Ligand binder design. Structure first.
Ligand SMILES: O=Cc1ccc(O)cc1
Ligand SMILES: O=Cc1ccc(O)cc1
Ligand SMILES: [Co+2]
Ligand SMILES: [Co+2]
Lengths: 382, 382
């Protein structure tokens, strides 16, 4: 059921911000590996003496890559006089974040109808504030509250192009890469305690529970906005098994709670993963090992309704996993970690079904794949 | 003249080490942009709980990319018990370096005959020590002294493959990229005072002066080993001009002295720059604006001995600059800065002449190009 209990009007996922040591090199790496275009910049060349920020886009997917300059460049500035385009940026918070966590997501940004309203209500409903609502060039309002660990939920509202103080990137350095990725489907957090984190975040958003899982590694539950286009899974470790919890492994190397992965919807996961796998070893992203043939044999038994033999065969060529709900079918695959630490990674998905537009969360999140993976793996050893 | 006054046996440039926030993302970016292969790793998967280090190679060019893990992973270690493969690494020095300078070169590594000898002699001749000589798996000795700013001159000696504790990278993730780059030709430092820096470095190496310049921006001089295969230019600002010194601009954004650029020799600078320019806007490196046609007109007057019309025309297609000595011809081009700050960049070169093998420094370093650039630029405005 859906109680539709949001405490403010939430529109959609807007952007994701990575805090980096060098924004250029991460952004250029992500651009090539994922097929996103360089579409906006705020830096020294735009008069920003505080931080370097570069935005990649694929469809409605926006990845923001931010790093601090030397504080010496903005030593004569104060917040009222700042040249930063992102007023919540802080040299010391950025360097502490990166030093503690390595490369990772700092902000999960959602568009709302009124960022100042959304901030006040949230804090009035238990959210720890992180940056109060600031109006940019009387056009855009932004505000931040704590989500989990050092990750912030960022509210954005527009009166009526990315942010003031950003510039459209010169056509020549903006090469129209595109491998089929269109928007952010969901963002998954890992915490030491799922209960308090669910209570906290549902407390100040009014987001409702969408799904849950539990017997191998984790417990999780998903919060969702009213129309369930903003989807926030949260995991916790389950201590006590033959294998160490990967959630727990995450928390160690990340120095605590943080964002685990971003699931990016592709309008054509076949072309997307062909393009990504072509580039895996020339600067792109690597992919988790592909399931055994066993798996893909059992898929004709599970989704032969949904995917032809040839489409199943293409799933096998590319290591794609398939789960099915009572309502939809989910094609999914995972990258290896995006940086040095085994912390953040990326998932590519495409959903089949739930036509009415397509309703969010169609097909679930893969909870059936745990079983079928081990079940198929027993059968490959044979 | 060459007094051949080195105080220890120096062989060649061995490797360059970048200190990074995330080693993976810089290394993958550099690999694609420059056409270097992933050939060795030391990280969690090799049992290194301290740092992540990835080595790219093109010919004899070795780029090392290093970043710290969370200190929490190695909290129970001490130097005698360390899992670091590079014993001079220090979590706190790395984070301070990167926070002060951004992405940049930490170590300029040269192979010597005896690293322990080279360290003792150097310190006995005025070098500030940075890391004392350490023997790795009774096979390799490494030692570090201060070069300028927070850059260290690293001595390496081998009894008789990169470093112990590193592993050859799996063939699949090692894609045989190659755009023609073969070795490091020279590494250029910027300092506030050229005099004391030349005195310091020549003092402890015995390197001799090879060349010098001065009237627009800088003064410089080059130190060279006995056979002049190790070449170390050093620049200082010249304050007082219509345009601000780019050396001075470097020192501001870098927070002091440091390495300005690395000149990489290509066995075919035409193919190299074709390959690099193809990738400039899809994750590679950008190039400084190309000289005007004026320039390339005057080149037939200057190197028509050396380059045919068609080769000059290919130079023009790719923005290559050409200088000529009394002894050789130099083709050169410069990238834009490698990261967020206008600090470190890269130069691609190829030298024609001085055949005997080719003698180092053949053709100089471009000091004639200052004049011919402005001279040609006056003639394009016309
Ligand atoms: O994030 C993984 C996940 C799997 C199954 C769920 O029900 C929820 C989340
Ligand atoms: O590094 C640039 C340079 C130019 C001319 C010189 O003589 C020496 C260095
Ligand atoms: Co998921
Ligand atoms: Co040079």
């Amino acid at each position: 059921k859906n109680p539709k209990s949001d405490k403010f009007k939430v529109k959609r996922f807007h952007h994701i911000e990575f805090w980096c040591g060098d924004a250029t090199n991460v952004a250029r790496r992500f651009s090539w590996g994922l097929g996103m275009r360089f579409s906006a910049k705020s830096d020294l060349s735009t008069g920003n003496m505080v931080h370097a920020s570069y935005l990649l886009t694929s469809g409605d997917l926006r990845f923001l890559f931010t790093a601090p300059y030397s504080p010496s460049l903005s030593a004569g500035e104060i917040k009222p006089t700042t040249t930063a385009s992102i007023p919540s940026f802080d040299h010391g918070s950025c360097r502490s974040f990166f030093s503690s966590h390595g490369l990772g997501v700092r902000a999960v940004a959602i568009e709302v109808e009124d960022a100042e309203s959304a901030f006040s209500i949230s804090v009035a409903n238990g959210a720890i504030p992180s940056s109060p609502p600031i109006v940019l060039n009387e056009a855009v309002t932004i505000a931040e509250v704590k989500l989990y660990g050092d990750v912030v939920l960022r509210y954005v509202s527009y009166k009526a192009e990315f942010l003031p103080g950003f510039e459209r990137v010169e056509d020549a350095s903006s090469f129209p890469l595109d491998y089929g990725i269109r928007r952010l489907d969901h963002a998954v957090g890992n915490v030491p305690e799922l209960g308090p984190a669910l209570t906290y975040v549902a407390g100040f958003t009014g987001f409702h529970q969408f799904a849950e899982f539990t017997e191998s590694g984790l417990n999780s539950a998903v919060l969702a906005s009213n129309d369930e286009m903003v989807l926030l899974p949260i995991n916790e470790p389950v201590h006590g098994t033959k294998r160490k919890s990967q959630i727990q492994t995450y928390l160690e190397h990340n120095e605590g709670a943080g964002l685990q992965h971003l699931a990016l919807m592709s309008e054509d996961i076949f072309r997307t993963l062909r393009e990504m796998r072509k580039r895996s070893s020339i600067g792109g992203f690597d992919f988790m090992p592909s399931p055994p043939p066993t798996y893909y044999q059992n898929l004709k038994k599970r989704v032969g309704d949904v995917l032809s033999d040839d489409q199943i065969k293409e799933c096998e060529e590319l290591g794609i996993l398939v789960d099915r709900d009572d309502q939809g079918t989910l094609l999914q695959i995972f990258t290896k970690p995006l940086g040095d630490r085994p912390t953040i990674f990326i998932e590519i998905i495409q959903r089949v079904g739930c036509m009415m537009y397509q309703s969010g969360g169609c097909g679930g999140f893969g909870k059936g794949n745990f079983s079928e993976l081990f079940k198929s793996i027993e059968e490959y050893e044979k």
